[PDB]
Ligand binder design. Structure first.
Ligand SMILES: *[C@@H]1O[C@H](CO)[C@@H](O)[C@H](O)[C@H]1NC(C)=O
Lengths: 50, 42
């Protein structure tokens, strides 16, 4: 990340100091939308117990 | 026995190298028939 002429691209380039190497705006978009499928491995014991 | 995010796969040999996808499995995993020949997952 060098002198671009005064241009900030930090909001759109990935942030190294965090996992998954994704942008802050991408973080916000990923947080706003909620999905019912947290994962894809739901075992027989999980459904039998609850 | 190899555990992926799409489930656990039985009958394939895991390899550290990366190639182009031939048969899509899911969750970033593909399989192919390669060389004394066997199925591999990568
Ligand atoms: C804009 O870029 C400078 C470095 O050129 C950085 O110090 C600053 O924090 C950036 N802007 C924001 C809001 O992070």
């Amino acid at each position: 990340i060098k002198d671009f002429g005064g241009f900030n691209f930090s909001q759109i380039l990935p942030d190294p100091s965090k996992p998954s190497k994704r942008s802050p705006i991408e973080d916000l978009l990923f947080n706003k939308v909620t999905l019912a499928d947290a994962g894809f491995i739901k075992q027989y014991g999980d459904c039998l117990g609850d | 026995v190899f555990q992926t995010r799409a489930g656990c796969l039985i009958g394939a040999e895991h390899v550290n190298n990366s190639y182009e996808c031939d048969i899509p499995i899911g969750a970033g995993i593909c399989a192919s028939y390669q060389t004394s020949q066997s199925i591999i997952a990568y």
